[PDB]
Design a protein around this nucleic acid. Structure first.
Lengths: 96, 64, 52, 76
RNA sequence: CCAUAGGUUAAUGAGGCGAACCGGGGGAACUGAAACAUCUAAGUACCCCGAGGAAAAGAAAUCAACCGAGAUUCCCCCAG
RNA sequence: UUUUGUAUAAUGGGUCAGCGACUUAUAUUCUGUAGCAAGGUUAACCGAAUAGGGGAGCCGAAGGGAAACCGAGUCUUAACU
RNA sequence: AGGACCGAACCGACUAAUGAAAAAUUAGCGGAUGACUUGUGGCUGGGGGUGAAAGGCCAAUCAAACCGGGAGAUAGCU
RNA sequence: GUAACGGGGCUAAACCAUGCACCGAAGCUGCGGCAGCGACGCUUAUGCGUUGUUGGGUAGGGGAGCGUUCUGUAAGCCUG
RNA sequence: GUUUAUUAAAAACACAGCACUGUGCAAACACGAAAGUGGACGUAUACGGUGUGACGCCUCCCGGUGCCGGAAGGUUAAUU
RNA sequence: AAUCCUUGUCGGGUAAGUUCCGACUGCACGAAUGGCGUAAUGAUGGCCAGGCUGUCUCCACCCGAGACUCAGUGAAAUUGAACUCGCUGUGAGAUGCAGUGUACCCGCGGCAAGACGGAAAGACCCCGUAACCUUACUAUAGCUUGACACUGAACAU
RNA sequence: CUUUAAUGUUUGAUGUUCUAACGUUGACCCGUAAUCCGGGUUGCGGACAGUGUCUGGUGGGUAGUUUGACUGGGCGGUCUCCUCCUAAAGAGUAACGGAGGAGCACGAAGGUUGGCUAAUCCUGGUCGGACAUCAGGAGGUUAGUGCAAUGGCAUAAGCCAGCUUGACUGCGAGCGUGACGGCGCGAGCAGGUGCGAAAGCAGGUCAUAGUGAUCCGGUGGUUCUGAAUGGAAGGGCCAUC
């Protein structure tokens, strides 16, 4: 980013935003990844064990992505509407 | 050694879904009362980086 | 640039303000215009105050 | 000397010509005065910029007693 | 005045040299920043003192996050 | 060789022989190629051991928003044709 | 008597023409009891010395000695 | 140093007009050969009949090779 | 008298003399992180610095910049 | 004048004097970064005279040392390769191109017009975002100010 | 509250004296054969002096640097923006080419509704004149435009008046123009307004100059964030300097 002596593109443009420390400990979980665990019950801990989310992860959503066939009990996790619907269809249970 | 990121660049740009780069417009920072409101409004939203200076940005930000 | 700048503040009691210029030599009296407050979403009286 | 100065060229002039199909919004002419006047389905901006208000073919024509140039849009 | 300083003997140890590594005491500039002064180079080069086969560090007035870990050192990640 | 342009009276070479200049390491991207493929791959280390273990991690399969958050949507805005 | 005079040694270096010589020659020239000259030894060290001062001299090197190191400084130039 | 046709020389071997010949290049054509890039169609060893066309080149981009030393193949093969 | 060793010996430097100025002695000043040393085993008829340069006849402006003295007021640090 | 105009003007000196000496609108002398004088001194600057002379008119001869030849020894800078002529053009100053003229091959002694001869990556000039040398900026040794510390006791205003 | 006096006690500073810190480059004694040094006695000085830390001043004594470019080198001039010409009838187009302007103004000089039409000259008319104001006419924009020039402008964009805040907030199909940063034009949609009987017009001004990226901060709003937790600080987002 040296443009002769003209003020380079980065320096021209204003800085913005801030980093969220809470974003680094959240996670997104596909529907496909609910089968990868064992026991048919999906906690954070379980996910971690199954190497789906990672050790420093306090929070995790389940997104409508891929597809779930087996019935699953999602526990202590956020779920999107679509994802939730999918889970229901599969024959699964959801709980806070 | 690992490539170092240009930290300023990182601060100023965010990579998008198709490998683009959004950025905040210039000219909406001070000396505002004189600027027409419409112009200001236009400036507000984030803007994609142009084809010309894309390369430079990329160079600056190897880890994106 | 003798003509100084000022801010018309909303009498709605919101923070909202417009900003503008005025010639304080020729016009000592305060500027009061009926401008649109976008927080209340109504046209309110806006009274001149110092830009600071 | 006292004479080095000049301004940036403004790229005025007829942008779309006779018969050119235009999308509504498109600028037909940039100009200083109303060299061309706004005719049917053409708007005149604050800087006298004539622009299509409808999708169609540009149509230059002389009209009225003063014999003034008028740009219209023919329907399409 | 007593004492103490000082003085003469005796015993024990030290001294000097040595590649790098190690801990401490001091500590640049060229250079980069397309100039330059903050900044960088770099606590680098160099000088000095001391040690050992290694040194230093080390047994939480430490982390952590309401769950827990359990001195120091070193390697890969974390992460440009 | 350098130049708009050199027989140039512009540069360099007395000749021969020998030596004499785009390397290497680590990151990153794109191309080819091989592997496996919604998966791919392990690092230190253990292992006298190029095997095998080791998946700590990394990249990918989701994005939008400054962020909380939402999520095939999302941000914008009181709300979007 | 004398920073007195003329003048060899000795110290110098104004003019001249000319490698044996990285400053000399020959022919003349100035000082020659003094602020003179010379032997031996000593001391002053680099932004430092010394300087009757020319940026002079400090080992044939001086508007900042030499040697080694930072060091393959940097070189948008050849 | 002739030195203001390149020279000899020229009264046309000068100039104008019309005409028909010839010379004249690495241009075009002829014959032979090589290579690139496209078309179609073979029926294949992934190239072949062909058939168009292209092939001056600095910076520079792309493609394909020669040779040198060393490791394997090699206690092989060549060599008094 | 001195001077650019090696293109300048001079009108340049020095000089006796003159003036200003500092310095009371643990002197000013200078070399030294300092101890100390020079000044000087000197003491204002002495020592340092600056300029001028034998001898003779001589030698307006304090607004500016310095230095010296003053301290009434304005402004003014750490501190509080 | 250690004064542009300027070889100022007048005088002296010379046959003739931009210099010299003496005098009379200070471009831009001037009083201790001293003014004006000044005997003596000076390898000091300028000017004039006497003497003297190959300095010169204008060179001549002679004596020695080299140069030349013979024998012995034996360098150096330079060097793309040379079968290395003149002229007029051309190409920006031609041994090398065009046209033309001249010229048998090779030494030796001489001369220096050219080979943009040799020598030193121009010293001038410019350029490029080194070095040394003020009321530029920024610091800083030193000097100086106060506050606290080492630092205590009385008494008064 | 204005203003002082009384009794009780409390910091600030100001000199005079002291003697015990501290100084002594005064004297004598001892270590000692010793002009160093130390100890001892003593005189003088004395809480000063002088040292450390902080602090203002001074500080080419010394150091590190900077000292623009264009330019038929320096000096002079220039450097951003707007108008015209050069510019070759789309756009664009150079010169130390030829000519001029800008670094604002305006709460009306903006919006809208209603109305109006200029310069100059002639003739007549009190003071009144080349030139005020008023009549009659010619003229036809030769005038006007807040300011340069160009292009515009009578449906006036020129001149008067009435009511007003659209010089609105969120957006924006689609275009123009730039290497980019950016700059510009914009019908329509939502909300809420003003003028008009209404159709409609209004997101500044006849248009084209009146301007400055980023960083760093400042002010107001905003629970977006908030390093154990609750807050806060700081950060973000919107507005603005």
């Amino acid at each position: 980013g040296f443009e002769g002596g003209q003020m380079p593109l980065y320096r021209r443009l204003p800085k913005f935003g801030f980093t969220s420390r809470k974003a680094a400990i959240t996670a997104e979980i596909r529907l496909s990844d609910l089968a990868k665990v064992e026991g048919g019950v999906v906690d954070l801990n379980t996910l971690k064990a199954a190497n789906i989310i990672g050790i420093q992860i306090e929070f995790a959503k389940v997104i409508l992505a891929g597809e779930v066939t087996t019935p699953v009990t999602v526990r202590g996790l956020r779920v999107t509407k679509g994802a939730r619907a999918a889970i229901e269809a599969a024959g699964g249970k959801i709980e806070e | 050694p690992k490539i170092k990121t240009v930290r300023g660049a990182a601060k100023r740009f965010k990579k998008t879904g198709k490998g683009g780069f959004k950025h905040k417009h210039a000219n909406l920072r001070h000396i505002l009362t004189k600027k027409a409101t419409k112009r200001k409004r236009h400036l507000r939203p984030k803007a994609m980086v142009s084809k010309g200076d894309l390369g430079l940005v990329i160079a600056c930000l190897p880890y994106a | 640039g003798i003509r100084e700048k000022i801010k018309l503040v909303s009498s709605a009691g919101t923070g909202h303000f417009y900003t503008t210029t005025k010639n304080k030599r020729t016009k000592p009296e305060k500027l009061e215009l009926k401008k649109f407050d976008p927080v209340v979403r109504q046209h309110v009286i806006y009274k001149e105050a110092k830009i600071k | 000397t006292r004479n080095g100065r000049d301004s940036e060229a403004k790229r005025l002039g007829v942008k779309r010509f006779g018969g050119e199909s235009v999308l509504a919004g498109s600028i037909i002419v940039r100009q200083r005065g109303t060299k061309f006047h706004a005719g049917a389905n053409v708007g005149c901006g604050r800087d006298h910029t004539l622009f299509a208000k409808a999708d169609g073919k540009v149509k230059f024509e002389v009209k009225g007693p003063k014999n003034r140039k008028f740009i219209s849009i023919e329907a399409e």
